Amino acid sequence: EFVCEENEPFTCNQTKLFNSGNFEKGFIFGVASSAYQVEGGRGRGLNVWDSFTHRFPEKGGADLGNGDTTCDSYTLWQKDIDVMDELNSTGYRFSIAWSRLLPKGKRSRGVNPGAIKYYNGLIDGLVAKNMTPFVTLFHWDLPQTLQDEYNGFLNKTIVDDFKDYADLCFELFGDRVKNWITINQLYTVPTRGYALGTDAPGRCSPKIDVRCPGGNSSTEPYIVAHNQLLAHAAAVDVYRTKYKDDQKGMIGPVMITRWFLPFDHSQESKDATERAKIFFHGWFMGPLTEGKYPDIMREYVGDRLPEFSETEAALVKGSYDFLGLNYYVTQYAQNNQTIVPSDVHTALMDSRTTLTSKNATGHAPGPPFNAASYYYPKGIYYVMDYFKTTYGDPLIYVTENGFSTPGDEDFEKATADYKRIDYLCSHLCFLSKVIKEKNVNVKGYFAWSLGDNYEFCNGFTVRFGLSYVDFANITGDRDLKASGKWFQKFINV
Amino acid sequence: EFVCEENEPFTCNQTKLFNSGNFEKGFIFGVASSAYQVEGGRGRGLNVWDSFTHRFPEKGGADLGNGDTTCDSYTLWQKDIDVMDELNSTGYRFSIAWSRLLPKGKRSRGVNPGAIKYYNGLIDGLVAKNMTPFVTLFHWDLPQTLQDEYNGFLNKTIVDDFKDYADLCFELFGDRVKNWITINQLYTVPTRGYALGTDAPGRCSPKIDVRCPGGNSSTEPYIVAHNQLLAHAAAVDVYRTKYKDDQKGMIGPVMITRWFLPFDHSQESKDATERAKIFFHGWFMGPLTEGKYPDIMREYVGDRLPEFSETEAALVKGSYDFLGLNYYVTQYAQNNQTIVPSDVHTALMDSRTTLTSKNATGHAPGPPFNAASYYYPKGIYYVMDYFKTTYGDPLIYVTENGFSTPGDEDFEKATADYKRIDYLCSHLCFLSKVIKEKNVNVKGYFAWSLGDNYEFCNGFTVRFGLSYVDFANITGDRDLKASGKWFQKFINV
Numbered sequence: 001e002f003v004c005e006e007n008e009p010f011t012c013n014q015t016k017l018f019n020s021g022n023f024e025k026g027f028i029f030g031v032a033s034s035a036y037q038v039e040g041g042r043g044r045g046l047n048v049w050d051s052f053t054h055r056f057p058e059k060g061g062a063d064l065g066n067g068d069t070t071c072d073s074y075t076l077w078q079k080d081i082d083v084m085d086e087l088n089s090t091g092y093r094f095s096i097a098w099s100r101l102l103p104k105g106k107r108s109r110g111v112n113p114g115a116i117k118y119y120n121g122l123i124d125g126l127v128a129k130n131m132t133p134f135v136t137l138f139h140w141d142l143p144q145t146l147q148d149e150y151n152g153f154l155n156k157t158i159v160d161d162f163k164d165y166a167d168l169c170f171e172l173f174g175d176r177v178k179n180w181i182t183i184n185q186l187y188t189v190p191t192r193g194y195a196l197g198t199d200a201p202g203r204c205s206p207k208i209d210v211r212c213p214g215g216n217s218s219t220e221p222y223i224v225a226h227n228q229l230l231a232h233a234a235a236v237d238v239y240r241t242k243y244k245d246d247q248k249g250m251i252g253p254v255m256i257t258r259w260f261l262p263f264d265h266s267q268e269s270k271d272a273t274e275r276a277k278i279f280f281h282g283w284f285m286g287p288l289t290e291g292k293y294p295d296i297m298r299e300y301v302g303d304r305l306p307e308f309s310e311t312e313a314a315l316v317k318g319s320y321d322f323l324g325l326n327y328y329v330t331q332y333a334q335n336n337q338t339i340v341p342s343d344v345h346t347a348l349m350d351s352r353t354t355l356t357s358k359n360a361t362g363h364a365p366g367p368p369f370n371a372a373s374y375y376y377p378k379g380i381y382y383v384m385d386y387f388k389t390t391y392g393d394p395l396i397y398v399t400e401n402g403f404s405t406p407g408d409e410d411f412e413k414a415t416a417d418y419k420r421i422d423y424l425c426s427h428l429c430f431l432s433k434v435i436k437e438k439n440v441n442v443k444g445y446f447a448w449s450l451g452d453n454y455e456f457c458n459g460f461t462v463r464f465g466l467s468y469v470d471f472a473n474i475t476g477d478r479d480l481k482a483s484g485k486w487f488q489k490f491i492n493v
Numbered sequence: 494e495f496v497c498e499e500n501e502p503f504t505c506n507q508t509k510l511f512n513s514g515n516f517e518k519g520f521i522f523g524v525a526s527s528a529y530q531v532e533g534g535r536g537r538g539l540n541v542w543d544s545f546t547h548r549f550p551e552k553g554g555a556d557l558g559n560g561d562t563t564c565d566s567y568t569l570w571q572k573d574i575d576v577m578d579e580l581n582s583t584g585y586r587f588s589i590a591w592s593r594l595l596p597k598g599k600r601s602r603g604v605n606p607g608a609i610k611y612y613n614g615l616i617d618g619l620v621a622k623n624m625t626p627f628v629t630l631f632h633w634d635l636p637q638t639l640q641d642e643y644n645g646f647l648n649k650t651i652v653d654d655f656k657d658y659a660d661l662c663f664e665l666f667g668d669r670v671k672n673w674i675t676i677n678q679l680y681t682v683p684t685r686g687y688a689l690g691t692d693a694p695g696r697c698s699p700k701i702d703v704r705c706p707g708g709n710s711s712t713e714p715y716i717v718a719h720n721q722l723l724a725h726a727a728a729v730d731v732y733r734t735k736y737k738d739d740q741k742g743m744i745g746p747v748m749i750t751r752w753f754l755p756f757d758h759s760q761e762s763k764d765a766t767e768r769a770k771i772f773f774h775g776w777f778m779g780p781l782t783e784g785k786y787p788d789i790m791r792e793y794v795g796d797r798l799p800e801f802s803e804t805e806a807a808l809v810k811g812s813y814d815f816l817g818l819n820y821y822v823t824q825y826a827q828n829n830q831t832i833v834p835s836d837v838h839t840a841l842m843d844s845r846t847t848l849t850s851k852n853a854t855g856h857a858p859g860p861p862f863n864a865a866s867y868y869y870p871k872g873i874y875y876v877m878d879y880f881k882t883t884y885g886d887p888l889i890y891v892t893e894n895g896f897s898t899p900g901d902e903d904f905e906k907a908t909a910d911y912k913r914i915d916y917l918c919s920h921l922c923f924l925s926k927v928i929k930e931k932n933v934n935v936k937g938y939f940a941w942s943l944g945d946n947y948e949f950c951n952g953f954t955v956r957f958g959l960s961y962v963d964f965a966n967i968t969g970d971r972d973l974k975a976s977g978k979w980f981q982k983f984i985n986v
């Protein structure tokens with residue numbers, strides 16, 4: 001029995017006391033990436049994130065970076081496998097770019113054969129290395145023409161287009177791909193893309209930001225999330241009834257997870273802490289389980305929250321085989337019953353709560369994570385436990401988990417990412433405890449990311465990768481950082 | 494009387510004997526640019542050239558450059574006026590970006606107010622500086638969603654969308670803008686964008702280039718050019734019936750002009766030289782004057798050449814008030830009746846001619862222009878005379894004329910662009926001769942370009958501007974090259 005440390009110093013970076021043997025045999029220790037962050041613009045059509053970044057370069061990052069060239073994994077895909085081979089990664093999570101397979105958006109307008117060859121090459125390369133291909137259908141890279149036609153997910157037309165795109169993917173790669181993920185972080189797009197206007201497509205209220213071409217921020221996020229659920233339900237419907245019969249695989253969505261703590265020792269904070277969990281996670285888990293949003297959210301939002309039809313409710317309910325939970329940090333929750341003017345009101349205010357980084361006394365829950373948050377290693381223990389106890393204990397994979405490091409660090413400092421090692425071992429340490437003590441059904445962990453790449457809304461100012469990628473010499477060998485070496489030795493027996 | 498020199502050395506760089514007084518008083522000596530090459534990606538939607546450059550970086554230039562930032566005239570628009578003020582330029586030619594005023598392509602989908610403020614600022618700045626606003630409605634920057642919906646100009650739908658977009662421009666800027674241009678270089682888009690696949694949208698035959706997503710190099714160019722005439726006629730139709738009554742302005746198209754010489758002293762070359770002029774110029778000038786395609790083109794192309802309807806023929810005929818001629822170089826023409834396989838045949842081969850840089854004896858017609866051609870100063874004299882005699886009422890504006898300089902030249906070499914001075918004075922020299930001797934109705938000349946910018950299909954490998962723009966320091970002062978100083982002294986007499 002090992003005592004996991006919650007604050008510095010950390011002894012989990014020693015493989016003598018912390019190794020893969022602390023987890024059950026067959027645990028998936030892997031890495032992850034996103035299509036827009038690695039692939040690039042070559043051989044693919046323009047998507048919504050291209051338009052958002054090009055029109056508002058600051059919104060895509062302070063460095064004004066974009067997903068045009070990044071590390072060019074579309075051309076250097078073999079290099080990613082080489083890094084994984086050195087990492088002994090048994091699995092890998094990547095995204096299929098909709099604007100690559102369907103540059104014109106719709107399947108009827110044509111399919112890019114070069115896209116199929118590229119993805120087949122990567123999948124076959126993983127199979128030759130005996131790596132499990134975790135595939136994300138949608139990673140926020142919606143084709144641009146779809147947004148210019150029916151505003152993307154704001155219209156229900158996207159459900160049919162997403163169905164056809166998913167239907168084509170199963171026919172091409174379903175023979176080898178067995179882990180299908182529909183959408184990554186369902187909560188992110190309606191909140192940061194349709195309420196705050198900080199992500200693509202950039203819709204927000206005029207008072208929230210004049211740069212937004214338009215938006216309401218009080219009705220659009222609920223509409224977009226409602227149509228996303230219908231599209232996600234339709235994709236699961238197609239896969240099980242046509243491809244699961246022969247390919248024998250599972251399909252499941254991925255949710256963003258955060259742990260919540262009371263701001264102080266008051267009952268109002270305790271209710272606000274519970275409300276934060278319900279609104280942040282139950283907003284989708286409720287429909288995923290009972291086919292309807294939580295009653296408290298339904299009461300609070302009222303008519304601004306749409307409702308699923310009888311046909312839709314059956315499809316949405318139980319529309320998952322596994323859950324790709326992603327946990328990064330823990331935040332404190334407090335009560336905020338302040339009435340807000342309509343011009344600046346956002347859907348995030350409907351919970352009547354305020355999320356903070358520090359406690360009432362200014363104490364952090366853990367070591368610093370980024371410029372404006374701190375990571376709480378025990379938070380992942382709570383998140384897995386919360387999902388297991390609140391919902392019928394499902395098959396859970398840690399599809400995304402990582403630590404941000406400043407990009408201005410030189411090669412020696414970036415490779416010596418001992419802080420990244422501390423983040424990963426500690427979170428894995430509490431992950432092992434919750435699997436053992438609480439019997440939580442967690443079988444896979446994917447560190448984010450495989451290598452340094454473009455970060456949404458931040459450009460290249462920070463790095464999440466386990467392997468350093470000198471963007472001045474992207475064709476050069478991508479050496480593994482000290483965190484990468486530790487992860488391989490952690491896997492190695 | 495000055496003896497115009499056709500080859501080196503050139504004595505036309507002395508304003509003492511060759512100045513603006515050689516032209517009639519009120520002659521417009523100005524500069525020109527295009528939206529995609531100067532404006533940038535900020536505050537505008539994605540167009541077809543964005544997709545072309547992003548998907549095929551090599552096709553957009555060896556340097557892989559694109560129109561994302563270039564000289565950033567959207568942010569530094571005052572700098573362009575300052576350079577023109579230093580040049581004593583009496584006029585200026587610019588383009589209104591369709592993806593800027595209408596980022597979604599269709600007028601019903603919304604109008605960008607920030608675009609209106611930007612264009613009004615430039616127009617108002619020009620008026621305060623006594624600058625003549627020459628506006629090009631379309632400079633090949635078609636909105637991407639329009640191409641992704643109805644294949645751009647390949648469909649007749651483009652006529653209605655272009656009509657509404659042109660109508661909006663007259664309503665906003667027609668109070669001050671009096672020189673409206675519908676399309677720039679009508680011949681270029683069907684040939685280099687739908688036959689060779691070298692320009693946007695990149696449609697070409699599979700054998701011509703596998704990189705092209707698809708196209709027929711023998712049928713698509715004639716269809717696209719047919720719809721351009723319908724779109725061009727519609728834009729003129731709107732201006733005359735609604736705005737010409739009160740605004741009192743002129744609207745006219747712009748065509749690319751080349752002079753042709755026999756390859757050798759044979760009759761077959763002489764026949765081919767006459768055919769080259771008909772196919773290069775008469776393809777549109779014929780319908781613009783007589784309402785029908787040239788008879789020789791109709792016989793040669795046959796069914797692959799479309800025909801105008803009775804309603805369309807009346808609208809297309811006489812759908813111009815002036816003609817913006819652009820002349821750069823002269824090419825030799827020879828006969829070539831070689832039958833080509835259909836899979837590799839291009840529409841350019843329908844003339845049964847071959848265009849060469851040198852004649853049969855290997856002699857160049859003039860001093861070198863670029864890496865693979867030479868400029869013939871007397872060619873502009875022939876073009877004005879040929880257009881005047883073949884097409885009565887020859888109201889002619891020289892909308893584009895310039896000399897390219899290699900980008901690898903350092904700051905000192907680029908500023909000392911005496912080769913550009915030699916090109917400009919000599920072409921202007923023959924321009925004065927044809928105005929007097931041949932009595933051609935030429936009133937304006939626009940040198941290309943105002944400053945160094947992105948070059949289509951070439952990136953930033955070459956420079957056409959009269960003022961040096963250090964692209965590492967785009968916000969820095971844009972000093973005038975020796976050609977810019979000469980041009981000001983040419984006017985300042």
Ligand SMILES: *[C@@H]1O[C@H](CO)[C@@H](O[C@@H]2O[C@H](CO)[C@@H](O)[C@H](O)[C@H]2NC(C)=O)[C@H](O)[C@H]1NC(C)=O
Nearest residue numbers: 503504505506507508509909911914975979982
């Ligand atoms: C006409 O062209 C000649 C040839 O370039 C110019 O003479 C150059 O002047 C610059 C600056 O005075 C010198 O650096 C060059 O060395 C000169 N050329 C040569 C070959 O020595 C002349 O200044 C130009 N004059 C006008 C009025 O444009």
Ligand SMILES: *[C@@H]1O[C@H](CO)[C@@H](O)[C@H](O)[C@H]1NC(C)=O
Nearest residue numbers: 010013014015418421482486
């Ligand atoms: C663990 O971290 C400490 C922190 O400085 C470092 O010195 C040590 O080399 C690391 N060991 C391993 C095995 O990662």
Ligand SMILES: *[C@@H]1O[C@H](CO)[C@@H](O)[C@H](O)[C@H]1NC(C)=O
Nearest residue numbers: 084085086087088089129488
């Ligand atoms: C595991 O990592 C080692 C370290 O380089 C490598 O040699 C080996 O090939 C890897 N094994 C697999 C199956 O990729």
Ligand SMILES: *[C@@H]1O[C@H](CO)[C@@H](O)[C@H](O)[C@H]1NC(C)=O
Nearest residue numbers: 149150151154155156157158
């Ligand atoms: C959804 O699709 C079609 C597209 O033309 C349109 O008629 C309908 O009004 C759209 N609805 C919304 C809310 O945009």
Ligand SMILES: *[C@@H]1O[C@H](CO)[C@@H](O)[C@H](O)[C@H]1NC(C)=O
Nearest residue numbers: 263264265359360361363364
């Ligand atoms: C401050 O944080 C600590 C742990 O980080 C927590 O125990 C304490 O309750 C917080 N302060 C208040 C007033 O709740």
Ligand SMILES: *[C@@H]1O[C@H](CO)[C@@H](O)[C@H](O)[C@H]1NC(C)=O
Nearest residue numbers: 334336337338339340349354
């Ligand atoms: C409570 O909400 C209001 C408006 O939503 C906001 O201005 C205020 O800062 C919030 N309270 C705290 C402590 O952040």
Ligand SMILES: *[C@@H]1O[C@H](CO)[C@@H](O)[C@H](O)[C@H]1NC(C)=O
Nearest residue numbers: 205206216218219342343344
């Ligand atoms: C959002 O829509 C509602 C419709 O009830 C309206 O009352 C509100 O003013 C809108 N928001 C903004 C910022 O206009």
Ligand SMILES: *[C@@H]1O[C@H](CO)[C@@H](O)[C@H](O)[C@H]1NC(C)=O
Nearest residue numbers: 470472473474475476477478
């Ligand atoms: C870039 O990487 C390549 C790898 O093959 C190497 O040969 C080259 O020296 C590197 N150049 C620089 C400037 O780091």
Ligand SMILES: *[C@@H]1O[C@H](CO)[C@@H](O)[C@H](O)[C@H]1NC(C)=O
Nearest residue numbers: 087088089488489491492493
């Ligand atoms: C452990 O590492 C060795 C190389 O040191 C490698 O050959 C072996 O395959 C690794 N173990 C597994 C299970 O891949």
Ligand SMILES: *[C@@H]1O[C@H](CO)[C@@H](O)[C@H](O)[C@H]1NC(C)=O
Nearest residue numbers: 577578579580581582981985
């Ligand atoms: C002509 O250019 C010169 C630059 O030397 C400038 O000072 C002058 O004001 C200009 N004349 C105009 C714009 O009438």
Ligand SMILES: *[C@@H]1O[C@H](CO)[C@@H](O)[C@H](O)[C@H]1NC(C)=O
Nearest residue numbers: 642643644647648649650651
């Ligand atoms: C445009 O082309 C498409 C076929 O891909 C179709 O919607 C339509 O028939 C065309 N437009 C018109 C006006 O016919």
Ligand SMILES: *[C@@H]1O[C@H](CO)[C@@H](O)[C@H](O)[C@H]1NC(C)=O
Nearest residue numbers: 756757852853854856857858
């Ligand atoms: C080729 O051109 C040169 C000058 O440009 C001329 O002297 C020569 O006679 C020409 N030869 C032909 C047309 O065969």
Ligand SMILES: *[C@@H]1O[C@H](CO)[C@@H](O)[C@H](O)[C@H]1NC(C)=O
Nearest residue numbers: 829830831832833842846847
């Ligand atoms: C004549 O045309 C054919 C096909 O376009 C080409 O292969 C041949 O080189 C041409 N002849 C000359 C002399 O260029």
Ligand SMILES: *[C@@H]1O[C@H](CO)[C@@H](O)[C@H](O)[C@H]1NC(C)=O
Nearest residue numbers: 698699708709711712835836
């Ligand atoms: C182009 O179209 C013609 C007739 O429509 C056909 O004969 C030819 O094969 C086509 N070219 C290609 C490359 O398909």
Ligand SMILES: *[C@@H]1O[C@H](CO)[C@@H](O)[C@H](O)[C@H]1NC(C)=O
Nearest residue numbers: 963965966967968969970971
């Ligand atoms: C950029 O240009 C400005 C003005 O020309 C100048 O003051 C500055 O020193 C330049 N900086 C660099 C790094 O070239």
Ligand SMILES: *[C@@H]1O[C@H](CO)[C@@H](O)[C@H](O)[C@H]1NC(C)=O
Nearest residue numbers: 513580581981982984985986
């Ligand atoms: C010559 O330059 C001066 C500079 O102020 C300018 O005012 C004038 O308009 C220019 N043209 C003539 C013909 O003087």
